Structures are given as structure tokens and as C-alpha cells.
Write an enzyme that holds these catalytic residues in place. Structure first.
Site, PDB file in Angstrom:
ATOM      1  N   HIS A 166     -27.138  26.826 -24.495  1.00  0.00           N
ATOM      2  CA  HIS A 166     -27.642  28.049 -23.871  1.00  0.00           C
ATOM      3  C   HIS A 166     -27.013  29.314 -24.436  1.00  0.00           C
ATOM      4  CE1 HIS A 166     -29.083  29.957 -19.844  1.00  0.00           C
ATOM      5  NE2 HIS A 166     -28.612  30.946 -20.586  1.00  0.00           N
TER       6      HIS A 166
ATOM      7  N   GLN B 223     -37.719  37.043 -19.037  1.00  0.00           N
ATOM      8  CA  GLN B 223     -36.590  37.720 -18.400  1.00  0.00           C
ATOM      9  C   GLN B 223     -36.890  38.555 -17.173  1.00  0.00           C
ATOM     10  OE1 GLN B 223     -32.529  38.465 -19.379  1.00  0.00           O
ATOM     11  NE2 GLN B 223     -33.373  38.115 -17.324  1.00  0.00           N
TER      12      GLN B 223
ATOM     13  N   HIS C 248     -33.784  29.528 -15.907  1.00  0.00           N
ATOM     14  CA  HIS C 248     -32.582  30.275 -15.474  1.00  0.00           C
ATOM     15  C   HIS C 248     -32.796  30.118 -13.961  1.00  0.00           C
ATOM     16  CE1 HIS C 248     -31.770  31.919 -19.431  1.00  0.00           C
ATOM     17  NE2 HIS C 248     -30.762  32.621 -18.938  1.00  0.00           N
TER      18      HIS C 248
ATOM     19  N   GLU D 223     -29.425  31.884 -10.462  1.00  0.00           N
ATOM     20  CA  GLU D 223     -28.220  32.527 -11.022  1.00  0.00           C
ATOM     21  C   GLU D 223     -27.935  33.734 -10.123  1.00  0.00           C
ATOM     22  OE1 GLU D 223     -28.431  34.214 -14.981  1.00  0.00           O
ATOM     23  OE2 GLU D 223     -26.251  34.466 -15.108  1.00  0.00           O
TER      24      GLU D 223
ATOM     25  N   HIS E  16     -28.153  33.547 -25.991  1.00  0.00           N
ATOM     26  CA  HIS E  16     -29.199  34.556 -26.181  1.00  0.00           C
ATOM     27  C   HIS E  16     -28.978  35.237 -27.538  1.00  0.00           C
ATOM     28  CE1 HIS E  16     -30.719  34.507 -21.940  1.00  0.00           C
ATOM     29  NE2 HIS E  16     -29.525  33.967 -21.760  1.00  0.00           N
TER      30      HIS E  16
ATOM     31  N   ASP F  61     -23.640  31.120 -23.415  1.00  0.00           N
ATOM     32  CA  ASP F  61     -24.603  32.066 -22.858  1.00  0.00           C
ATOM     33  C   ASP F  61     -24.751  33.365 -23.652  1.00  0.00           C
ATOM     34  OD1 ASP F  61     -26.601  33.013 -21.201  1.00  0.00           O
ATOM     35  OD2 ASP F  61     -25.359  33.172 -19.402  1.00  0.00           O
TER      36      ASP F  61
HETATM   37  O1  LIG Z   1     -31.077  36.115 -16.823  1.00  0.00           O
HETATM   38  C1  LIG Z   1     -30.156  36.131 -17.652  1.00  0.00           C
HETATM   39  N1  LIG Z   1     -30.178  36.803 -18.882  1.00  0.00           N
HETATM   40  C2  LIG Z   1     -29.050  36.793 -19.809  1.00  0.00           C
HETATM   41  C3  LIG Z   1     -27.926  36.120 -19.515  1.00  0.00           C
HETATM   42  F1  LIG Z   1     -26.917  36.135 -20.343  1.00  0.00           F
HETATM   43  C4  LIG Z   1     -27.846  35.385 -18.257  1.00  0.00           C
HETATM   44  O2  LIG Z   1     -27.836  33.957 -18.734  1.00  0.00           O
HETATM   45  N2  LIG Z   1     -28.976  35.444 -17.402  1.00  0.00           N
HETATM   46 FE   LIG Z   2     -28.852  32.937 -20.109  1.00  0.00          FE
END
Ligand SMILES: O=C1NC=C(F)[C@H](O)N1
Ligand SMILES: [Fe+3]
Ligand SMILES: O=C1NC=C(F)[C@H](O)N1
Ligand SMILES: [Fe+3]
Lengths: 423, 423
Positions: free
Chosen positions: A58, A153, A211, A214, A60, A310
């Protein structure tokens, strides 16, 4: 070309082992009764630990290296992070994304990571980052097998044309369908978004990585829908629930009931220690909760859980060198997996468990598999973790793709003495 | 002998600086307007960061390297840790203690630590570890200034002859008087033990360092007595309250009232991130509190707080390489000091603030001070912390006492490329 890896230690096994290589694959694995001599075409593990490659389940890559641009996430929360990212997303360019993604990918190659799953924000009509990442995937293929998650997102139902854009991302080649139910406007949109995510995954035969919950909200229970839909469709192996930080705040009775379904469903879980300890607990004063999902209990129940980094210098995390042993170190401390065996077995959280999460079909030190493996200059998982050792050699397809000449530390006492921090 | 340190960056300062050395001291510090050429007798910092030595304000050298002997701390709690230590304490020998203490001290020298405060358990009629440590103090003096705390691990009033043994330890030369009020049988014994600790410190002119409220008990408020007695005696600079983890669980109103006294008293605080995240929160199920004292608020209020490693492979901590940047990394995450400036200024928590805690009189890069300094191959505190850099050179009395040749990482892409993880 390399024909053998000698003097290798293997997790859970006694003694030393020899790994024979042929045609880019592992042909056989044989135990040694002593130390073997080096020779041309033999890579000497020098009694270090040999394991399949580290995995990043995981990350980005579309946001990496952008922290502070154009503004910093002052509150250190998920919510402000998304707002700061929105500002940066409006400034994206094709080359911008490729350059930053490649910078972090090189750190990953150096760190023995050969499998990476990157989420890419597809709440963007231009799909700028996705188009760039699809090219990066092809370019980095000789070194890393990159999976791309079409990550909505800003929501599927809560963003203009969110569902159409999510499907467009799959038609362009994204490997995994994402979702973010706790960010949708309502609980009903959250649940509905999951039905749509599963329908798309079945329509295109793709994996799922949500996701999920969270947020420090004891009422955020989207994970039960992810697991139930996976069980209904008989596709648990293809499904992942990322984060589930809300589970840290659930009462124990509901959690016990839920665990039966989590196990039966067969879905995977990703915890992101470095980011979770930073973004969770931000609405508490004191005491402050840790906010990582129930990793220890998942392991005790045989539920597959693993660790991701992450973010690497982005809106949600100002640090990082994309180092999985560092991610593991944080997770073991925060989750209190501090028994000797728990620490030693920790490597599974960044190797085998992560490979299962990515549904990998060619992973592990076994005959017939591709010769993809790394060598750590340590005696076992505990030692590697304690000393935060680098990757001495990374081998892919039977060839060395990265190597680290270890640092050399000397203290000048009555006489010079080399220090390796070992006992 | 070395005459100058050139091309040095200094925290909080712009540009490069030259540090002139004479007779083992710093004679002058001058700004450079560009990069200076190297030459014999000049140590080139190569635009790296130069800071006074790292400091370890809280470690247990009598217990180091004993984890699992004869049994492991299964619960991961302070209380079981003390029981497991009691079993090991009964097996102590003079040479045993010296060998293990020296092993960890060498790791500290390698890590640029030139000042160390070790607690030594004096709840032992034989005072075996104390006698051994007093010899180690003399032996390691050329490299580390070691302070010894007479630590009555099992209590002053709650252990047979505890007060007499504590005083005997001071008569033998211990530098600091310790206490552990929350471990005494009753709150009254806890408060009384502090009056006795302060009386001994004034009788012998010694410093004070109390293991204070190291427990997730919102009613453990011994810190107010430590601060009030220090204020009454006008000796705040000589007093330290270690841990104060109970403060993580106090209501905010009492904490606000207390903070006025903490500031007025001038006492020092030590937080031990690696151990606190592991031992605290062990009686919670979920959510689980972090358990570190209020570091962020102390910094905002101008209260001196710093970080210690506490344990290196002992009953209370199964890991460690005695690395202060690693301790700092954990503390910044758990305490949520994750803003860019907070991370960059983090070095103060393991340098200047710790020197104040040890009441050091010769510390800092300033003319007239001993030439004790270290060089980090990084641009600033943020960079050093993010990349967990080693200590390139450690200089003491104007001479190099440790050096680390950095690791060299290469990735083999279309062409070989050196990777340094920088941006
Ligand atoms: O919704 C998210 N965007 C970016 C991140 F780094 C986190 O994992 N959650
Ligand atoms: Fe993430
Ligand atoms: O009382 C204590 N003994 C040893 C430790 F490591 C912890 O600092 N607390
Ligand atoms: Fe301690």
C-alpha cells in the site's frame, strides 16, 4: 550468470541451505551440513538470511514527494490531508507524476522491494496521474511488478461522475478497484459504493482494495460489508481491506462477532503503522489512542494481515525512505508484538502475508518459482529488525539488481575496534 | 592534531561555518561565505551538520544485554519486568556487569554519545552492580562522561534497609539520587520517600532523578511533590522526573494547574519513547493509550523535556542498538510532533535538552568549551532524522574517537545508479 546461492539461512529452518538456479528460476533447494566454499557463479549469502522480496502492499506513488506543495497538512489529519492533496492534484502534469513515482520506486528497488501496489487518485476527470502511472508500470517492470489501484479518493457516489471515472480507470488498465466508504457523504452511500465496487471487480475480473474505516469512529463498520460481499461472491483471496483503523475503537463483543466473518471470508488486511500512528488519535486530547487495526488478534486468529508504508513525503506523511523493516519496527512497537518470537516472525508481515494480499502467483523460495530473492546480512528476522539492516543483495530473474556495501563503524579506544552492534 | 572543522552546517543557522580548535577546546567559530578547501589538520564536515554530542539521559547499564535471563517478560509490563530483573539480579557478578555495560557503551561511543546517565539498582545489600559500574565509569572516562544514579528499584521504604542502602550508594560515589514512588506500597510511602530523596541530595550535594509515575494510573501524581520540593529548595536545575507516563492519563484541568508549578520549579523531564510505547497501555484492551508523557505541551510551555533509550535488550525492552536518532524517530511519531519544524528541531530532544537534564557545564559548540562534537552526513535535523544517518565522525577533546564510513547502495537499471535516499 549466477548458478547458486550458498550459505543461506531460511526463516523457520535450522542450519544452512543452498539454492540452485537455472534459467532464471529456482531449480532446487538443498540443505548444507556446513559452510560451502565460494566460487564463480555462486552468490555467497555468508550465513545471512535469504527471503523472497520485500513487498509494499500500500503506497501512493501519485502523491509521493509532494509534502508542503502548495501547503502543509497542519493538523496532521486524514481530512486535511485530502484537502491539501486536492490543491496539489489541480497542478499535476504527466512528467511531474512520472518523475516523482520513479524517485520513490528507485528507493524501493534499493530496499529489496520487487512487488508494489500503488493507489492512484481517480477522482479527476483528466486522469492525469493514472495515465502517467500506467507508463511507469511498463517502464519499471524489469525491476518491480507494480499493481495500480483505481482509488476514488473523494468518493464514488459523493464526487461528480465518480462511478464513471472509476470504471474508465479499469478500462484503461488499473489492476485493482478501490473505494473509500467512510469518506462518502452518508452511511448509505458508503454501503452502496461497496456494492458498486464489487460489481465492477466481477465485471472486469480485477482485485479489490478498499480504504476501509480509516477513521476513529466506533460506528464506522464498512469492513463487515467488504467481508460479507467477498464471502457471497466466493472471492476473498482477491479482496483487501486497507487500514480498518476504526477497529481499534470497537467494543470487544462486536469485534468478536465480526472476527468469525473476517476469517470465513478469507479477505486480506493492510495496516500502515507509520501513517496510522501519525493520523489517528488526532481528535483525542489525553489519553490518546494508538489507532492501528487489531493486528495481534488477526495473527492469533489466522487472518491474513500485513504492513504498508502508505506515504513517502506527501500530504499524509512528512518522512520515509520506503524502508519496510522500518515500517515493521513501528508496527511491532505500536501493536505490542514485542515477544521474541513475535518480533522474529515479523518478517512475514512484510513478505509472505503481503504477497498473499497482492494475490501473487510466483512468490517464495521454492523450486519452480522465479529466482526472485533478497539477502539480509543478519541471522534471523529478529536480528534484521533489531539492527535495521540494509539489503545486501536483491536478485530478480537470477540476476543482481541491487546491492548495498554495509557501513563500516570504528571506535578508537586503546586500539581501534570494529563495531557491528551484534551480540 | 586537528586544528579546524570546516564546511559545517549548524542547527538554526544559515550557511557554512568553520570551527577553530586549540588545546582540545573550541577557540573560535567563524562563518564562511563559501566552501573551504580541505587541508591537513582540517576535518571536512562536507556541508554536513555539526552538533555537540548526543546524550543518553536515561539507561540501565546494569541490566543491559540480559533479556530472557533466566526468563522472559511475557506480559511486557513494568511490573513483570521488575520481577524478571529480580531473578537476574540474584545471579549478578562483578565481571558480568562490567562486560555487559561495556558492550552497550561501545555501541554508544559508535553512535556519537559522549554523555550517559545510567541508573543502577541499589535494592541489593551486596551492591554488586554499583561497585562494578563505579569501575566502568573510570574506565570509560576518556570517551564518555558517565553519571550513576543510585536507583532503589524495589522502593526506599518498601524494601529492607532501602534508605540505608541508598545512602551507602551515595557514600560510595553515585552522582544522582533516585526513587520510585509509584512502586512503594502506599501513596504515603511514596510521598515520604521523596522527602528522604531530597534530604539525601542536599546532604551530599548530588543531583536527583526519580522514576516518577511510570504507570497508567490517573491518580499517580508524585510529580507534583518532586516539583514542589525542588522549588522549595531552589534546586530545580539539579532535579529530573523520568517517565511521568501517568501524565498521559490525567484530566486536562489538573494538568493545566500542574504545569504552572512544573515551569516555576525548573525541573527536567525525560520521556523514553521506545520503552514507553511498549510497557504502557498494557492494561487497556481497545482503544489502547500511547502512554508517553505530555512532551508536545511541555515544549510549547518552555519546560525542559528530552528523550532516553532506557533499556537495550533487557527485562523491559527486547531490542535496541543504543541509537538516539531511532529513539527520537519513535518519540516524534507517538507524540505527534510531525510538523516540519517540530521534526527538524527534534535534535534538541537528544542533545541540548538532555545536556540540561544532566546539568552539564561544558556542552555546546561555543568558544571556550571542550572540542566535543559530532558530524552527521545530513543537511539539517529533519534530513538526519528522516534518513536515520550514522555518525560520520565523533570528536572529543579535539580528537576523533569514532567514525563511520557510510553504506554504499547501488541499483542496476539500464545503467548502475547510486542511491542515497535524498531529494
Ligand atoms: O484516503 C487516504 N489517502 C492517502 C493516504 F495516505 C491515506 O492512506 N488515506
Ligand atoms: Fe492509502
Ligand atoms: O523502574 C524501572 N526499571 C527499568 C526500566 F527500564 C524502567 O525505566 N523502569
Ligand atoms: Fe528506567
Amino acid at each position: 550468470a549466477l548458478q547458486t546461492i550458498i550459505n543461506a539461512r531460511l526463516p523457520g529452518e535450522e542450519g544452512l541451505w543452498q539454492i540452485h538456479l537455472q534459467d532464471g528460476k529456482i531449480s532446487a533447494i538443498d540443505a548444507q551440513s556446513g559452510v560451502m566454499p565460494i566460487t564463480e557463479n555462486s552468490l555467497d549469502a555468508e550465513q545471512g538470511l535469504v527471503i523472497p522480496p520485500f513487498v509494499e502492499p500500500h503506497i501512493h506513488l501519485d502523491t509521493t514527494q509532494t509534502a508542503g506543495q502548495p501547503n502543509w497538512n497542519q493538523s496532521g489529519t486524514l481530512f486535511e490531508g485530502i484537502e491539501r492533496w486536492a490543491e496539489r492534484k489541480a497542478l499535476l502534469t504527466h512528467d511531474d507524476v512520472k518523475q516523482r513515482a520513479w524517485q520513490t520506486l528507485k528507493w524501493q528497488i534499493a530496499n529489496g522491494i520487487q512487488h508494489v501496489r500503488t493507489h492512484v487518485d481517480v477522482s479527476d476527470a483528466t486522469l492525469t496521474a493514472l495515465k502517467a502511472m500506467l507508463e511507469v508500470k511498463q517502464e519499471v517492470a524489469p525491476w518491480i511488478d507494480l499493481q495500480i489501484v483505481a482509488f476514488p479518493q473523494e468518493g464514488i457516489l459523493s464526487y461528480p461522475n465518480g462511478e464513471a471515472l472509476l470504471e474508465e480507470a479499469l478500462r484503461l488498465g488499473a489492476d485493482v478497484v478501490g473505494a473509500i466508504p467512510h469518506f462518502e457523504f452518508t452511511r448509505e452511500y458508503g454501503v452502496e459504493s461497496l456494492h458498486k465496487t464489487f460489481a465492477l471487480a466481477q465485471k472486469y475480473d480485477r482485485l479489490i482494495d478498499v480504504h476501509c474505516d480509516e477513521i476513529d469512529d466506533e460506528q464506522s463498520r464498512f469492513v463487515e460489508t467488504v467481508a460479507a460481499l467477498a464471502h457471497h461472491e466466493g472471492m476473498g483471496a482477491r479482496v483487501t481491506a486497507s487500514h480498518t483503523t476504526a477497529m481499534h475503537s470497537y467494543n470487544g463483543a462486536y469485534t468478536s462477532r465480526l472476527f468469525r466473518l473476517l476469517k470465513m471470508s478469507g479477505i486480506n488486511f493492510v495496516a500502515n503503522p507509520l501513517v496510522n500512528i501519525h493520523l489517528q488519535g488526532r481528535f483525542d486530547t489525553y489519553p490518546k489512542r494508538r489507532g492501528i487495526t487489531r493486528v495481534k488478534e488477526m495473527l492469533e486468529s489466522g487472518i491474513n494481515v500485513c504492513f504498508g508504508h502508505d506515504s513517502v513525503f506527501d500530504p499524509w506523511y512528512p518522512l520515509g525512505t520506503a524502508n519496510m523493516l522500518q515500517v515493521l519496527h513501528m508496527g511491532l512497537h505500536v501493536c505490542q508484538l514485542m515477544g521474541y518470537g513475535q518480533i522474529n516472525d515479523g518478517l512475514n508481515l512484510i513478505t509472505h502475508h503481503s504477497a498473499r494480499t497482492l494475490n501473487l502467483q510466483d512468490y517464495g523460495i521454492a523450486a519452480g518459482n522465479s529466482a526472485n530473492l533478497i539477502i539480509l546480512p543478519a541471522e534471523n528476522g529478529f536480528d534484521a529488525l533489531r539492527r535495521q539492516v540494509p539489503v545486501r543483495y536483491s536478485v530478480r530473474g537470477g540476476k543482481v539488481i541491487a546491492s548495498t556495501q554495509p557501513a563500516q563503524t570504528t571506535v578508537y579506544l586503546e586500539q581501534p575496534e570494529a563495531i557491528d552492534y551484534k551480540r
